[PDB]
Structure formats: C-alpha cells, structure tokens
Design a binder for this molecule. Structure first.
Ligand SMILES: *NC(=O)CSP(=O)(O)OP(=O)(O)OP(=O)(O)OC[C@H]1O[C@@H](n2cnc3c(N)ncnc32)[C@H](O)[C@@H]1O
Ligand SMILES: *NC(=O)CSP(=O)(O)OP(=O)(O)OP(=O)(O)OC[C@H]1O[C@@H](n2cnc3c(N)ncnc32)[C@H](O)[C@@H]1O
Ligand SMILES: [Cl-]
Ligand SMILES: [Cl-]
Lengths: 311, 5, 311, 5
C-alpha cells in the first residue's frame, strides 16, 4: 500500500466573550467586520492585542469554521496564529493583531520608504511560510499581497485560509468544483481545470512578489478577468518591474511557466532570495534606497501573541 | 479583487 | 576590500506566441527543434526573420532559461542577439535568424570558395566577440566552429551559451562539477581539473581556427575522447593546416600552451589577425584564392534584428 | 561531438 494519514491533534480554543475589549473597528466590507481589541484571560496578568473577525447564515458559519480548522492546524513564525474562536450569534475568529495591516496596503502607503532590504526579506519570509505550509501538505489557493500581514516591517506572516485545502499523504492535487476565485493570481491550470497544487501556489507567489516589486500595482490592471486565460495561453506574462534586475524577474517568470513541475519549489525560492538579501542593491535598483527606513490599552502587562504560548 | 472562472 | 558587483539590469522580453509564423523547420536532433519564422509585433509594421528553438521536463526548462539569462545579458555585433522567449508548453528561445547557419557547415559546404580574406576576417570577428565576452566577465566554455553563426559571409557571431558562466568581479576561474563537455575543444586544465577561464576559452579559439583553416576537418579525427588528455600531456597538438604559414600556425600553437597565462589574450588575437587581414595571401596560401567569392515571407517591411533596436 | 570527462 501507500502512505497513510496521522491524527490531527490540534487544539481548538473556545474563548469567553467577556475576555475581549473591542477597542475599535479595523475594517469591514466583503468579509464581515474586523475589530481591534485585547484578550484578557481570567487569572494570568496578561493583555494580548488581537483582531476579532465577527463575520449570520449557516453558510457563513460553516465557512468561518472551516477556516479556524486550518488556522488551528498550523504553527509557524510566518503563518498568522489563531488564538481561538468565540461562539456567539455568529462565529468570531480571534487572531494575533498585526498593527500594520496587510502588506499590499503597507507598501502602497510607504512607496517612498520601501528599501530593497525589506522587500527581499519579505520575499524570503513569505517563501518560508509557504514552504512550511507545503510540509503540512496544505494548498493555500489564495496567496496574494492582500493576504500577507505585517507584525512589523521586519516580520510578516501569511493569512486568510478561507480557501485552503489539506491534501492527503500522497495526493498531488486538489480539484475544486466552482465558485468565485481570484483569477489574476491563479495558475493557468487552476483557471482551465480547477486544479490546485503547491506549484499553483508558487504561481500565486510570483504574482505576490510582482505586486511587492511594483510597490502595489494591480496585476493586468484594466484587463478583464475573463480575458486573462487567453493572454496566458498566448504566452504573455506580467511586465518586468522597473526596480528589478533580470535576476529577480527571472525568478518571477519561472513561477509562471505553463509546466507546474518546472516552476521552482518554495525551498529553492527561500534559498534564492536569501542569497540576494545579502547584497540587496545588486538585485533591486531603487532610487534613494540608501536613506529608506521603516518605523516599528495600557502598556504594562501587554504581551504579543508570539510570547503567549498556550499549549 | 478578481473573481469568477 | 576588493571589487564588488554591479546590478544586471538586462531586460528579458516575453513574446506573444501569436506573433510568430514558423515558416519551416531548420533542424532538430540533440537539442530539440529549431524552426525558421517571422516575428510580427502588433502595431509597428515590422517583420523580423527569426529562429525559434522549441527545446518538456523541469531540467530542460531550467537549462534553456539559464541560457536566455546569458543571452539577454550580452550585447555586441559579434554575439548572437536574443529577441526574447515564449512561455508555452516548453520554453522557446527567439533569436536573430542567421540565414547561412553555423560556420562549420558553411565552410564544409563551400570548401572550394573560402578565400583567405574571409577566413582571416572570421578569425578577427570571433576574437572581437570573445574579447567582448571577456569584458562582461563571461566564460563561454563551448567555443567551436559549430557554435558560430553566419549572418552573411562577411559577418559572423558567436552563439550557444548553454554552458556559459558569469564570473565574479575578481574571480579568476570557474570550477565545474561534472557532466558531458566537448573534450576535443577544451584546454588540458579543463579536462584534468574542471577549471575554466577566459584563457581556456582561448584554447577553444585555437581549435576553432584550426577547424576553419582545415575547411571543416574533425580535430583529432578518430582518436577516442578518453585518450585526448594523454596526447596533450605528452605534448602533442593538432597538425599545421596545409594552407597555413608558420605565422598562423604559431598563433594556434600559442593557444595550446600548457600554461594558460602564456596563451594570448583575445585583444592580442584581434590585433594579430587584423594585421594579417591586410595582406591575406601572405599568411594563407590557398589554391585559386584569387577567384573565390561568396554570395549574400514577403520583402517589404522585413527588417533584420540588427535594425530593430528595442530598448 | 566529443563528450564526457
Ligand atoms: N475577493 C475577496 O476574496 C475579498 S478581498 P479582501 O476584502 O482583501 O479579503 P477578505 O478575505 O474579504 O478579508 P480579510 O478578513 O482577509 O481582511 C479584511 C481586512 O482586515 C485586515 N486584517 C485582517 N486580519 C487582520 C489582523 N490579524 N490584524 C490587523 N488587520 C487585519 C486586512 O488588512 C484587511 O484590509
Ligand atoms: N554535443 C553537443 O553539445 C550538441 S552538438 P550540436 O547539435 O551542434 O549543438 P546543440 O547545442 O545541440 O544545438 P544548437 O541549437 O546550438 O544548434 C542546432 C542547429 O540549429 C542551427 N541554428 C541554431 N541557431 C540558429 C540561428 N539563430 N539561425 C539559423 N540556424 C541556427 C545550427 O546551425 C545547428 O545546426
Ligand atoms: Cl472552492
Ligand atoms: Cl557544467
């Protein structure tokens, strides 16, 4: 026979609603609402900065729970950590607060301060996260700059596991059936046959990097989603970002090969960008890159989730 | 943010 | 400290497959297939004669891309120009069409028409190309008559960068690890220690000239590749070509010295052969050399790649 | 065309 499955002994923590203090809304629209607050577990003198997602039909609940399932099953420095859920009117996901929001907005808001060093290391960090995810045998299916959070300019993590799927021990791919999926970030295979693999996540990684290298530009801006499949088949791809050397662009391009197994592996990606991070200005030619720097309820018993390690 | 296939 | 590295801002053009018109196959075998066609970029009224290499495993792709990387990084009148690549099933390299093929086949096909003037100038041209390559700090590792294309009998260029390697600012040599390499064209150092330098490219230049002077004869014809290393160590070298004066043979011989730094520099080679080109019949004694001459979709908006200078 | 070392 072939390889089997091991038990998933992840713990799903259920939190007391009277332990939060929704300090202020962080954002809402097409996903429900995301507030900002503190989690203050009875007893222990600890105040944890958190994000509360209060996304009331059965479909919504069944979906936000599928998400918590994934988040509760992964543990890595570059993957957003789930603190637990709250079972009230509608299920609330509680996660570590990322003070600077999603990377897409962050680079758009600080175009004039993103140096090559930060960019390349973000690339390394995202690759480490995804590489980890591949070990767990999990296909994210929605990697994009908007789904990468910023704890600090020096530390980012992958988030939004609402489309993630966990493959079997020797399963090579996931066959989706239907529904809205972000076309401009998906691999040709995914668009044409609804096939998802770690390698199609690699294609999404290429687009994420591009977004970052273009300081937040929109992929195929203006081009209708329905035309994307054509363009790709014809061989066209996203343009070489102005600050990129052929070295970096080459990595992106390999991520967009028609042949999935030809694209690079996250482990290789981590290696490539690490090397480049050792001599940043040699791979990204950014104006004023020499002088670009990025910054960093009651501060007392406040502890970041990364230092509150409950079993 | 790009949808549908 | 020592010298550093500068950014490589070469642009890698990705072409629309619907912009080519593969007119007919040019050749295939141990490298994939090479068709002949036109490139017709949307808009501009331009038809460019091109060569399409359609060489589908990950190894193949990873290798043809390494090649495009080099080609996209060099720009010189005597180095084949890369127009871009096409990302379809398997990566296609698009290059300027050289109507008369590789020099080896060309001299074999026109033995009875190769005059001393053409030969010597080809020698000058190849040296200029390689000298250029040395400035870029690039070791070709596979110079040979078969890897020199003919745009016209008066203009040749170096091609096939599948083994090329780009050295560091002050790196003196490249240490290969293994794999098939053309023994009869490599320097003793390369065979014994897998060391490659501009100087070992000079040894290959010597053999290329010999091939040309012998009108296409095979180096060490008959002798097994495995014996070559012995012969060389013993001091033996390729024979003096019938049409060669001791002057020309002497240059070849210097290219085959055991001591790499003793061999001539391409810049010197260019000078030597230039002088000789001014009085051809004095260095190459060819029969009937006085009467030897060499010749030269819809002709309308057809423009050779050398006149289509995209940024 | 000559190979191996
Ligand atoms: N087409 C689509 O799938 C919707 S696009 P989207 O609106 O970017 O993604 P969506 O999944 O709908 O929402 P998500 O919850 O991923 O993000 C909503 C906003 O809230 C901020 N956010 C999310 N988690 C955060 C944490 N942990 N800390 C601070 N801020 C957080 C995001 O920046 C986003 O703008
Ligand atoms: N031992 C070996 O490395 C293989 S020997 P080879 O078969 O001579 O070299 P290889 O690298 O396998 O093939 P390459 O693509 O270099 O040449 C194949 C044939 O196609 C013709 N060719 C190549 N580029 C051309 C351009 N740009 N224009 C016209 N014709 C071209 C060559 O003449 C060669 O015969
Ligand atoms: Cl789905
Ligand atoms: Cl090699």
């Amino acid at each position: 026979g072939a390889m089997g499955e091991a038990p998933n002994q992840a713990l799903l923590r259920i939190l007391k609603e009277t332990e939060f203090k929704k300090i202020k809304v962080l954002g809402s629209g097409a996903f429900g609402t995301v507030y900002k607050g503190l989690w203050i577990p009875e007893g222990e003198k600890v105040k944890i900065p958190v994000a509360i997602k209060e996304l009331t039909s059965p479909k919504a609940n069944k979906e936000i729970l599928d998400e918590a399932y994934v988040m509760a099953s992964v543990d890595n420095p570059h993957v957003c950590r789930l603190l637990g859920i709250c079972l009230t009117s509608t299920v609330q996901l509680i996660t570590q607060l990322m003070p600077f929001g999603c990377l897409l907005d962050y680079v758009r808001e600080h175009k004039d301060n993103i140096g090559s060093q930060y960019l390349l290391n973000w690339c390394v960090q995202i690759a480490k996260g995804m590489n980890y995810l591949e070990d767990r045998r999990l296909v994210h299916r929605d990697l994009a700059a908007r789904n990468v959070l910023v704890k600090t300019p020096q530390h980012v993590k992958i988030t939004d596991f609402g489309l993630a799927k966990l493959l079997g021990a020797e399963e090579k791919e996931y066959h989706a059936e239907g529904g809205k999926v972000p076309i401009k970030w998906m691999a040709l295979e995914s668009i044409l046959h609804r096939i998802y693999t770690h390698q199609s996540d690699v294609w999404s990684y290429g687009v994420t990097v591009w977004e970052l290298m273009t300081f937040g530009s929109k992929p195929y801006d203006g081009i209708p989603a329905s035309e994307i499949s054509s363009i790709l088949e014809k061989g066209e791809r996203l343009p070489q970002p102005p600050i990129c050397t052929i070295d970096v662009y080459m990595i992106m391009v390999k991520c967009w090969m028609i042949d999935a197994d030809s694209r690079p592996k996250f482990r290789e990606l981590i290696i490539e960008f690490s090397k480049m991070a050792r001599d940043p200005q040699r791979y990204l030619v950014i104006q004023g890159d020499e002088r670009m720097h990025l910054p960093s309820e009651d501060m007392d018993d406040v502890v970041d989730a990364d230092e509150y390690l409950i079993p | 943010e790009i949808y549908g296939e």
